[PDB]
Write a protein that binds this ligand. Structure first.
Ligand code: ADP
Ligand code: ADP
Ligand code: ADP
Ligand code: ADP
Ligand code: MG
Ligand code: MG
Ligand code: MG
Ligand code: MG
Lengths: 667, 373, 373, 373
């Protein structure tokens, strides 16, 4: 009931006032708030079957000024804008893990499918079935959530003359460092544990997978049973959906073979064994690599020479080089990461090809993206996540400033001259070409005799004078970057081991000549589709640039999601949690965009006791401010007299408050 | 605008080039300019009057082989310009006006060499930026180290450069003019003891191939001479390009020993082990410990089987008996300098140390003496 | 609000710091500021342009060692500020704005030294309170006594301070500029007699290590010189950081004898025994008895084996034959001053003798001359 | 029985000898021992297996030049014995067993050097008496003075000795190992910038001749570098012994500047002006006045045209602005030490300060440490 749909019209905009408004609306069983172009949603933990097909006709765009703020208004807004400006656009779903982003995606897909009276006839267009599968491949347990999206899910819904066509799904910002490394009290991607829990016996005797609790890629977390809510029934339903997608049993068997090969590669160790003139490397147990070779249809000596020797090959000769232990570990980790990424790309490509729509058609975008993260201790993954969220916050700030400018021009022409300060310096501090932090890290990757301390010292030197950078006082292995959401302190512990994604051409050549068809096809396709680099940060930056280009091809308009207390309590929340989520989402920056402005008729009406203020003013353009300005010697802080009088400044507001408080001391 | 910078290790006898960021040179061919000498009789086949390295390798029998680079210094400038033009256009098929280029050089080379190199690579090919780096620092870059003495021994020069934690000691740099080409000439002069005569340039390169495929360095010289002239166990046979079989005895290992005994050619200098020890003893004591512990190799002419063991034995005999000598002999002694140059040119912090065209145009060619080393 | 006050004995050659109430200094490292001198060739390793004491100890071979404190007085203020900042942040990891600090000083040092020390430690580090205490009174505090003459002989100064029951005699304080650093320089100059040449700063510190590990003081000089140049029993060998073995003969004990015979360096002053006797004979007779009976030592340069016996013999030869001379040589001659400072700073009755920030701000830096000593 | 005592100034690179009482050395020749290295083919001309200084100068092309004296200390004793025998018999034609001999030495040389010198000159040549005198006191004798600092800079050592009215100050004697031979080596290393290569010993001596005939010291370094690399006015040409003409530019004056800037060779020491000023500031104030007023020079390597003016400018910049600096540069900087030795050996009051054969036989060689200096 308590609407306050547009908080721009209030006397002043503060985070406390916004929090109070959201609390009041949540107590009114209202979730969505229509802040002009932007929308805000809160996870209610409450099953709301809002209406049904009637809501499209009830919450259409014809009465946006009177219609309640709802998520489904954007469904009609998209069509209304594309039928007028003749330009497709994109919609992003952003928010921290567990904020109902998947629920919002399902709701918007249902609304778009239900608006054309055709989905009942062509429900065979098999669109959303694989969402749990991509979830099991792309989600993992975090210290704050048991279901966290760790990849930039992208679903493209295609349209042609009002007819809903097929869809194309893609991944953008998957973190490859999770497969080999994982922090404490967290674990790897859910599907490894699902496979190990739902493993049938025939795979137990055939594939040596009796060490499900002692794999190095999995035991790193220290406790894999915290996710005990998941079980082998998830594996059974995953297999049911997998068969539904038209995959033969051979494809599933090959996928399990690759996953078992990755898990076995996780359990490979090296020894600092003596050699001709140095001590380089030696494989401890050959039975494990032999078993890897048996189930991968590839020579075992190939793997030995690809993870132990470095190949420098020219036209007239090919020279083998012994490798150090750290280099061998990096090569093994790169092999595992590239195998996992190729599996994900293959599955996404097949899913897209099954329901591939027509080409050269219209398209609406849905983007599932990360949330701003600030843990007790932060690592490389958090830095990449923060960089991506910084780019998206830059886009959001651009949108907000565009809305402010168009409103100002709609009022009077001459306020387009108002400026705006963006977060470009932070983006340059992170990844500017000459001396960016990620560029310094990339240089340190290949630099001889490098360690974490040297990288930290170089970062401290090159960014001492940067206002956003913050050198710690004590000699601590940390640094602090001033994001838009506040100060974040990272730890430089183990960055150099999270970037050595070097895959020499000999490994790809070995995997092309594999006897199995799927692996050979995947590596051949990877070599055919392939300028690039050889670090996790560089690939992340390339994918982020591709995503930014795709977004700027269309018009960005999206929605933010917030979360109440994480103890799954419906209808109860902490205001501090609201403040934290509001800071992390980035909607607080709108207050900074406001930099204030109030109507002058409101000042005439409710200030009737200001020096016996005359209320008989029927004109908003009448001279009332300069009259008080020169008679009361009010400093002329105002730049120019407006018509609507939207020239109010905070210093003038403070002066008015001071005058109000001093005049009231009559008796 | 991503543009990979070319790395062109134009050594004294072989040109090794490629893009930065690779793991091996894209193109390897001898730095030879060939010109026909006989008279052409067939009308039409008298137009190709200059063959660059590999083509001149294929047609040795009807033309003369001239090396533009003699003992490090660039003698014939037109031939070197032809080689650069070939390796830019006909070999990599990459326009040089869109890519920065990196070049290597001996430590104690003349200055007019650098000035003319910069002038040619800025005026002719119009390269946006270029840089000249000493070969030893690139060898250390490629070895993944920061301390130790680099013994870079190409076929035109053999020089030592002591480096400790990135700070070079320029007063301990020693350079010898004894290199692989002089070994080839000694092999030509020492093969006449068995009756084989090699006089022309093609026969000189046949002798070079013999040296590459048969020569080795022994641990002890007197013992191996006695063994050679006490049996036929060390004799090996080689087949000339006309099916004529030659046999080599004690000449197999007496060719590369002149590196340790340069009195065979008559030079007054000392062997490479002695120069390395003297270069160490020109450094500070705290420097001397790590220089002892971290000897490294590079260059083609250090690929003889048994070089590392003998030079280790000689350094250990020279150095005090309580120190540990460990000589690094990676299997990429050839084109280790190129691997180091590729690593160096791929660094994003290196972008500010180029020589931009505006800098050269405003301050002249002398800045190559200021921004290098 | 319990806040332990820091005790920072910034001596002339070594910085010994820690918290009050401990029994040994938490951090001990030389007070050296090192700066590289050669040219950097590796791109990236050219940023650390100043190494504080221990880091500069580790990298002697590529940088120059400069001592900010020369003969007690602070010469280079920026280097000393760097050393203080290092020992506060990178060594103890304790913010200096939350802990009071105690500093030591030679007795007869200039006054601008104290004024600038207070100004730096109040304006830069914003210490809540600081105090400057003479080293001899702290040595007496650490020795658990209240009478006797302190012979504090660091590596920058050697001074005597007679105290009787807590009442100092400021007209009997004698100070000599002959200390350990001059002994090290004499050892450098006297080692050339055998052919060993030490010129650089790193070689000077190698000589310092030799002095610490081999030198001793003999009871009789002529007898020991005859013994040394009559046999090889006193010869000892030392190993330089490159495995080179050196042999030392009569130079072993002729280095620390200049303390008793300062004419070797050419100084006109007298030995430490003579200065102690003259300082006693500047005091009252009733004072003189207890000053005779309670000689005490401190400072590093009094750790030579045999110093106590010889100085006892010399004082007994100087003093009247009926008095008892007893020289206290505790095994903590090094950092006895720090132990005394820690005892003094932990007293609850000392809380009122600090120099609070309000006092310095209202009366200026001159109060350091009023509240000290 | 009138017997003139021989004066044999056996310096580090040249031997200057003669009789006492003359005004110039009778014999001057380099101290080089040459040995052939090639193989003799003519039967009969294979007997002269060692050429002393001047003969080895005449036949540089077929033999190796070795200096027995390296940086002051006598390295090879047999070669030095050969040089002494030559300069006694084949050069002066005077039996050494009938004439006393006087020898010179660096100040801070080792002691075994003196002991072996006395042993050789008493046992081999059977000289009736000999004496070893420091070179600086002889330079002061020859200059006709009794006060001032002697800057004796040969080709093996450069040392300062402050003397005031005949009383030496042995604690202010400073010695540097930077001398003329290191200047020659720097010239060899700096001539490669123009392409001239000098590696052998004969080429090293050709470079030495170039240094003697062309090098000079400028007043200002930056101005002269700009002038050199702004015109061709400073370029001079030299003719090698085969008619090949070489041209020298800014290398003309950048060779002898390392005396004032010894960082070019990498030494951590300071220039000769700085060492002279520091040696003065190690002396007493009343001494300091006359040391300022009476600087004197000697040694060959101080004959560069313009050395006096620059060192005067540098001392004046270092010394207080009110004092008068007057540097004595007599035109006999070469063999001034010999003139002083001849004056000293001709005094009749010197007859009692020899080292007689009976004294050496009864007390052993150690008396050379007692009767000298
Ligand atoms: N607006 C909403 N209305 C009703 N239920 C919701 C809403 N948003 C989230 N939920 C419920 O909250 C639960 C938590 O899901 P969540 O962990 O947020 O999934 P994801 O993290 O993939 O978005 C979901 O099962 C969903 O049914
Ligand atoms: N395997 C080998 N064994 C012996 N000598 C070799 C070998 N390979 C190359 N060389 C010698 O190295 C010389 C040059 O090799 P390299 O150092 O690669 O080129 P550059 O000297 O131009 O850097 C050739 O003259 C050749 O004689
Ligand atoms: N065991 C030892 N034997 C001889 N001399 C020593 C010994 N330990 C230290 N020294 C000398 O004492 C000098 C300084 O020691 P110390 O008094 O502890 O520092 P400070 O002089 O700064 O108070 C050093 O220069 C060193 O030469
Ligand atoms: N006219 C000159 N100009 C420059 N240098 C000279 C000149 N004459 C001699 N020298 C240098 O002085 C060095 C030795 O000269 P001198 O002092 O006479 O002999 P010694 O050093 O043995 O006493 C030689 O190495 C030579 O380079
Ligand atoms: Mg999700
Ligand atoms: Mg090479
Ligand atoms: Mg002390
Ligand atoms: Mg001389």
């Amino acid at each position: 009931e308590d609407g306050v749909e547009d908080m721009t019209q209030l006397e002043d905009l503060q985070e406390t006032t916004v929090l109070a408004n959201l609390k009041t609306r949540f107590e009114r069983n209202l979730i969505y708030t229509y802040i002009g172009s932007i929308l805000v949603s809160v996870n209610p933990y409450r099953m709301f079957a809002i209406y049904g097909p009637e809501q499209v006709q009830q919450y259409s765009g014809r009465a946006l000024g009177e219609n309640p703020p709802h998520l489904f208004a954007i469904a009609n807004l998209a069509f209304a804008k594309m039928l007028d400006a003749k330009q497709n656009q994109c919609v992003i779903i952003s928010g921290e893990s567990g904020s109902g982003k998947t629920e919002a995606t399902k709701l918007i897909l249902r609304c778009l499918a239900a608006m054309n009276q055709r989905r009942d006839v062509m429900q065979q267009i098999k669109i959303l079935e694989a969402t749990p599968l991509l979830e099991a491949f792309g989600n993992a347990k975090t210290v704050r959530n048991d279901n966290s999206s760790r990849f930039g899910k992208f679903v493209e819904i295609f349209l042609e003359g009002g007819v809903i066509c097929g869809a194309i799904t893609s991944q953008y910002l998957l973190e490859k460092s999770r497969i080999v490394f994982q922090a404490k009290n967290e674990r790897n991607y859910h599907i490894f544990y699902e496979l190990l829990a739902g493993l049938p016996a025939q795979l137990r005797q055939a594939f040596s997978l009796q060490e499900a609790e002692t794999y190095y890629y999995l035991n790193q977390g220290g406790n894999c049973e915290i996710a005990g809510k998941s079980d082998a029934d998830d594996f059974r339903r995953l297999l049911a959906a997998m068969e539904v997608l038209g995959f033969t049993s051979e494809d599933q068997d090959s996928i399990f073979r690759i996953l078992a090969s990755i898990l076995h590669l996780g359990n490979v160790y090296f020894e600092k064994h003596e050699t001709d003139a140095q001590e380089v490397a030696s494989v401890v147990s050959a039975r494990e690599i032999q078993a890897v070779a048996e189930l991968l249809q590839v020579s075992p000596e190939g793997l030995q020479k690809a993870i132990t020797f470095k190949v420098t090959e020219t036209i007239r000769e090919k020279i083998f080089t012994p490798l150090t232990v750290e280099s061998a570990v990096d090569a093994r980790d790169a092999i595992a990461k590239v195998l996992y990424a190729l599996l994900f790309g293959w599955l996404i490509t097949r899913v897209n090809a099954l329901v591939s729509p027509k080409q050269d058609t219209l398209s609406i975008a849905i983007l599932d993206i990360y949330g701003f993260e600030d843990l007790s201790f932060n690592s490389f993954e958090q830095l990449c996540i923060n960089y991506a969220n910084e780019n998206l916050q830059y886009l959001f700030n651009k949108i907000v400033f565009q809305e402010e400018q168009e409103e100002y021009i709609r009022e009077q022409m001459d306020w387009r001259e108002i400026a705006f300060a963006d977060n470009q310096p932070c983006i340059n501090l992170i990844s500017l070409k000459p001396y960016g932090i990620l560029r310094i890290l990339d240089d340190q990757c290949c630099f001889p005799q490098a360690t974490d301390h040297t990288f930290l010292q170089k970062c401290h030197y090159h960014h001492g004078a940067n206002p956003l950078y913050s050198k710690p006082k004590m000699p601590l292995p940390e640094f602090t970057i001033k994001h838009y959401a506040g100060k974040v302190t990272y730890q430089v512990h183990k960055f150099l081991d999270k970037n050595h994604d070097q895959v020499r051409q000999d490994v790809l050549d070995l995997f092309v000549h594999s006897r199995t068809r799927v692996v050979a096809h995947l590596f051949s396709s990877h070599a055919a589709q392939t300028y690039k680099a050889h670090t996790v940060a560089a690939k992340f930056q390339q994918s982020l640039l591709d995503l930014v280009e795709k977004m700027e091809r269309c018009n960005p308009l999206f929605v933010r999601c917030l979360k109440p207390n994480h103890k799954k309590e419906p209808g109860l929340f902490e205001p501090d949690v609201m403040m934290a989520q509001l800071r992390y989402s980035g909607v607080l920056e709108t207050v900074r965009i406001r930099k204030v402005r109030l109507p002058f008729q409101v000042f005439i009406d409710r200030y009737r006791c200001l020096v016996a203020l005359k209320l008989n003013v029927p004109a908003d353009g009448d001279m009332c401010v300069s009259l008080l300005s020169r008679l009361c010697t009010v400093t002329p802080d105002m730049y120019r007299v407006g018509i609507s009088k939207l020239f109010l400044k905070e210093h003038l507001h403070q002066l008015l408050e001071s005058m109000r408080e001093r005049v009231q001391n009559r008796a | 605008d991503e543009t990979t910078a070319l790395v062109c290790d134009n050594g004294s006898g072989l040109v090794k080039a490629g893009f930065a960021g690779d793991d091996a040179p894209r193109a390897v061919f001898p730095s030879i300019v060939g010109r026909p000498r006989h008279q052409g009789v067939m009308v039409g086949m008298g137009q190709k009057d200059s063959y660059v390295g590999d083509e001149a390798q294929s047609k040795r029998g009807i033309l003369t082989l001239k090396y533009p680079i003699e003992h490090g210094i660039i003698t014939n400038w037109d031939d070197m310009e032809k080689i650069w033009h070939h390796t830019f256009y006909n070999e990599l098929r990459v326009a040089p006006e869109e890519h920065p280029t990196l070049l290597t050089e001996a430590p104690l080379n003349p200055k007019a060499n650098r000035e003319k190199m910069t002038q040619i690579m800025f005026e002719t090919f119009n390269v946006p930026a270029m840089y000249v780096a000493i070969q030893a620092v690139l060898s250390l870059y490629a070895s993944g180290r920061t301390t130790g003495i680099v013994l870079d021994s190409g076929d035109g020069v053999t020089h030592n450069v002591p480096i400790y934690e990135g700070y070079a000691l320029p007063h301990a740099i020693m350079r010898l003019d004894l290199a692989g080409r002089d070994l080839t000439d000694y092999l030509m002069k020492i093969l006449t003891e068995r009756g084989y005569s090699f006089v022309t340039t093609a026969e000189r390169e046949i002798v070079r191939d013999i040296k590459e495929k048969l020569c080795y360095v022994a641990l002890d010289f007197e013992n191996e001479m006695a063994t050679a002239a006490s049996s036929s166990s060390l004799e090996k046979s080689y087949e000339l390009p006309d099916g004529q079989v030659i046999t080599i005895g004690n000449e197999r290992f007496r060719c590369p020993e002149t590196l340790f005994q340069p009195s065979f050619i008559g030079m007054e200098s000392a062997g490479i082990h002695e120069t390395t020890y003297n270069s160490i003893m020109k450094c500070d004591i705290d420097i001397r410990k790590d220089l002892y512990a971290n000897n490294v190799m590079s260059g083609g002419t250090t690929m003889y089987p048994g070089i590392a063991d003998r030079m280790q034995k000689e350094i250990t005999a020279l150095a005090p008996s309580t120190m540990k000598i460990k000589i690094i002999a990676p299997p990429e002694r050839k084109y280790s300098v190129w691997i180091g140059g590729s690593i160096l040119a791929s660094l994003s912090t290196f972008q500010q140390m180029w020589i931009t065209k505006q800098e050269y145009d405003e301050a002249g060619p002398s800045i190559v003496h200021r921004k290098c080393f």
